[PDB]
Amino acid sequence: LDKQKELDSKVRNVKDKVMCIEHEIKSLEDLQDEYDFKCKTLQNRQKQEQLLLKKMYLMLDNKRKEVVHKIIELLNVTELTQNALINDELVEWKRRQQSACIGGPPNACLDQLQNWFTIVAESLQQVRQQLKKLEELEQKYTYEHDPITKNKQVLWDRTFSLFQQLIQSSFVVERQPCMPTHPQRPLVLKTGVQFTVKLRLLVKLQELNYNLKVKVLFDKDVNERNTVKGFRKFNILGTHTKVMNMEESTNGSLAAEFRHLQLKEQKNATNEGPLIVTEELHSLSFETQLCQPGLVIDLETTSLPVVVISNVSQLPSGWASILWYNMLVAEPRNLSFFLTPPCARWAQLSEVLSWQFSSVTKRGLNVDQLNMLGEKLLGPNASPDGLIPWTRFCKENINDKNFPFWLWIESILELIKKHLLPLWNDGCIMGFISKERERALLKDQQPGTFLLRFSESSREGAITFTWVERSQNGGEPDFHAVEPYTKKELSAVTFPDIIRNYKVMAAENIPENPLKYLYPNIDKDHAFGKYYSRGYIKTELISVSEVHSQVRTALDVLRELTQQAKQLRLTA
Amino acid sequence: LDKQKELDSKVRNVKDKVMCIEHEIKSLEDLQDEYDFKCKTLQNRQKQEQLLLKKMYLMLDNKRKEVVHKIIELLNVTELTQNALINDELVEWKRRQQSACIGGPPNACLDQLQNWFTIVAESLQQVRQQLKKLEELEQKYTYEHDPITKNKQVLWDRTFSLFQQLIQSSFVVERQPCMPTHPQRPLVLKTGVQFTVKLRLLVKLQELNYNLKVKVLFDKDVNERNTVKGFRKFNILGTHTKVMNMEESTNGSLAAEFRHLQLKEQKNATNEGPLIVTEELHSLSFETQLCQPGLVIDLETTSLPVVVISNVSQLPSGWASILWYNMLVAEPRNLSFFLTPPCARWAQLSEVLSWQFSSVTKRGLNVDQLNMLGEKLLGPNASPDGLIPWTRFCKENINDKNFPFWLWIESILELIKKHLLPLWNDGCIMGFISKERERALLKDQQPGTFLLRFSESSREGAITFTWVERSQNGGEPDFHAVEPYTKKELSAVTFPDIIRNYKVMAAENIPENPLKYLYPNIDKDHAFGKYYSRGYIKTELISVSEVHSQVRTALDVLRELTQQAKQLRLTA
């Protein structure tokens, strides 16, 4: 399952190959020196020894031929490992970085990648040093068709182009733009709020500590700003530059954290646009440069596209765009919406929805909840291939409703985070359930039994219980749900308190709590025990329902008032 | 009732007197000129005419004697009016300015005072001009015992000293220091919050527009800072200066509003103090100077002492100190507490308490509410002479309680402002009533009847209803009060809603609302009508009391449960 094992070996092999080369060049100059030594002492005037100086010559030429073969052999294996490193392992990191940012499983450490990039780079610069001591031996001693001279140039050019792009691709945004004051929603930034972003260089060469300075550019190289209509122009406030180093990081990595960076719009002084503000993407790019003796390398990375918003109202709308982006696109195309947004497909939305909950809460969406939502978006066919347009997700109002899909679940999340967390996290809430299934689950259940479900018609995001009562005829019983509770109500008293002291009352009758067992036949106080709040007359504060027309209570008048309704509007 | 009528006349007389003087000096120089004219033409050589030039001489001397008498007569009436103006009318303004700032009736306009100060000052400078044209005539023509020369110096010195202190006393703080973000609580300022203060000069002389610049000094000339132990040292942030003018004001007055002034403490780098922070007073003083041709006047006014606090928690505690100050002291003594704070007396506290409500609300304390509070502080004797120590007001906890008096009423005010305003403002709340009177008012009342009273044991500040039920024996009925409601509860549902849907309930019994009539036999829904809030099952949210042991309801089991208590612990 790990191509890491083979990659470790290749770069091990790379390190192992440069080191023999270094060993063989030492004896190459060792013999180069005694050839000059012998050939010079013999010139200073039957023990021929000219047979030796002819052999010592051939060794030198063979040895030269050998290390030139060994270097090109190495440049050929390192071309193969970098292609893997840069074009597989690193590319896959970046995709699972955009999965992680929007709710996926956590990303691994950059450290395996950094370790790979590093010793490849460390080998790539030892070869540079070897190519240069070979040059020292070439002009101390050359001859016809010197294998040093015949490969000197393209060996030099091959190591650099490799080294150049290697560290060029090493320039990664380790942590994407993210307003700390809004931690769980990166890539969306509000004018006047500071955000942070951390760049990293994976090659980790001590020679580079405090030697690279990164500039931040907003909307660099914009054809879209003057092509697309009404594009908004912004500017970065803060230190636009920062120098990389290794002690600020705790892991010793070479990075440059732009803390305290903020964004404000231009003062151009309105126009219409085919792309609404949250649908409009920008990008934050970064530039640095490696000036060393004789060589110059230009580095340029870019963050994932960001959405900028005017006020916190636009936070959930914007985050839909982020999600649609990193769900589908893997490339920074700032026109991905335009008005060509791809429809997503349920097999992906299905679990990125599940992510929005496990990231916020400690519990994700289950299959039964996913079928519910599936049907709401697609229909009866719960097909993984199901195509979910972007308009049906955040633009057009869902089905026969007056609010879009995503915002309906954002505010459900809101509510769960702020009021329903331990209930939801313990799995007491069967919140995602159509009214059709809702009924069919309780139909053959004890009349004390209920279930908590989220309302599909509350824009502000509410929860409600549904219970079943018997209805003259044994089959086709009576199904009741209370008006669902928004945060306004649960701020005043928690849902577990509401459930326990709920009363159905009626003029001149005993109140009684309809709710007796939660769905799998579990007693109310045994189910919601741990979630309860727990000289004058004490007073408590409770939700109640007056029906307004054991012994006869108010649910006995509830039963009668609804059969009278059912016995009315009968056919004849 | 108005000494204004006589004052208007005196300063009218003052203006009327300078104007005849100006008329008489014109003919004084008119005749001075023809005396020189005749006496010179006669010198240029039986129609004596030396009889004329002897008479014209006597007129001049008499006229001179006359305007010197008329000026000293005026300087004598203006000494009398300024003493009134500066030492009565203005002093009384300043006392009713400190009454107004802390809840008294609104203060009048400075405009009558400004008009007085002005024409007195305008007269005082026309006299200066007259004293100077007299000087012009003196050296054109003098002689033995010239009445001009014999009074010239002290006339000059009398007009200036008068003019000097006149405008010196004209330097008033028109609007006291007051954090706008805390409007109803001036003289208390929090470090880092801007406050405003407006100085005014009442003399209103166009010559002075944009010609006076006022500096603000904090704690100027402090013997107390190094005498009293642990005194805190602060500093003003902002423009410390500002120039007076007349167009910034809308009434055309000469004033200098220090907007955007703020305060921060020193960085001396803890000690103990006999005076706690809110008990510690400071003062903000102001300096300006009148540099005109030949004369220099130094002006120095001071605001009422201010309390500085670290955070809004100290706002109600500090305001007690302000109140105790401007209730008793009329002079800016910054040690008024020290540990010699005077006891206030009920005849004053009584209505300054009533002020705290009519300033906040639209309704003050009534006699019945005042007797209540009187008794709580003093006792059975409701004497106006009653001495109320400062310790019993904000320092030591009231009676057998764990909280001080004043803060108990601040949080009642808080509650009324934030939850009970229209109830309180319509006089539906009999909130100030001991339990003893509370009972004795309902004893002979219908059993549906109740009354709303403030709890005397709620530090956070709560309201509750008390109703009466019949109790086997007709006399000595049953008195019930619910645990009183803090703001936590009334945020969730308003008190009028709580009252209407209040239910006493009990296991297997009908609920019923005990509350049927408010005290003067007024039906619940007819009393609290206007204050009510007014496909699932609807739900509402209501306060209830389970007694936990027409037809038999839950107040019938309430009645039985309390006689069983009363029938228990009986004597034998």
Residue numbers in the entry:
A (entry chain A), B (entry chain A): 136 to 180, 192 to 415, 419 to 683, 700 to 714, 742 to 764
Question: What text appears in the publication on this structure?
Answer:
Signal transducer and activator of transcription (STAT) proteins communicate from cell-surface receptors to drive transcription of immune response genes. The parasite Toxoplasma gondii blocks STAT1-mediated gene expression by secreting the intrinsically disordered protein TgIST that traffics to the host nucleus, binds phosphorylated STAT1 dimers, and occupies nascent transcription sites that unexpectedly remain silenced. Cellular, biochemical, mutational, and structural data demonstrate that the repeat region of TgIST adopts a helical conformation upon binding to STAT1 dimers. TgIST binding to this newly exposed site at the STAT1 dimer interface alters its conformation and prevents the recruitment of co-transcriptional activators, thus defining the mechanism of blocked transcription.
Because this structure was of limited resolution, we fused TgIST-R2 to the C-terminus of STAT1. In crystals obtained from this construct, the peptide bound in the same place but was now visualized with much better resolution. Four X-ray diffraction datasets were merged and scaled to yield a final model of the STAT1-TgIST-R2 structure at 2.9 Å resolution. TgIST-R2 adopted an α-helix and was bound in a groove between two loops formed by the SH2 domains of STAT1. The density of the two loops, which are not clearly resolved in the structure of pSTAT1d alone and only partially seen in monomeric STAT1, are distinct in the new TgIST-R2 bound structure. One STAT1 protomer shares a 551 Å2 buried surface area with TgIST-R2, positioning the helix deep into the grove. In addition, hydrophobic amino acids in TgIST (i.e. L383, V385, and L386) are positioned opposite to the hydrophobic patch formed by F614, W616, Y651, V653, and P663 located at the bottom of loop 1, and L664 at the bottom of loop 2 in the STAT1 dimer. For example, R387 on TgIST forms a salt bridge with E618, and a hydrogen bond forms between T381 on TgIST with E661 on STAT1. In addition, residues D627 and H629 in STAT1 collectively form a hydrophilic surface on a small β-sheet, where D627 forms direct hydrogen bonds with T390 in TgIST. Hence, the altered conformation of loop 2 in the dimeric STAT1 structure exposes a surface for TgIST-R2 binding, that is otherwise absent in the STAT1 free monomer, thus providing an explanation for the specificity of TgIST-R2 in binding to the dimeric form of STAT1.
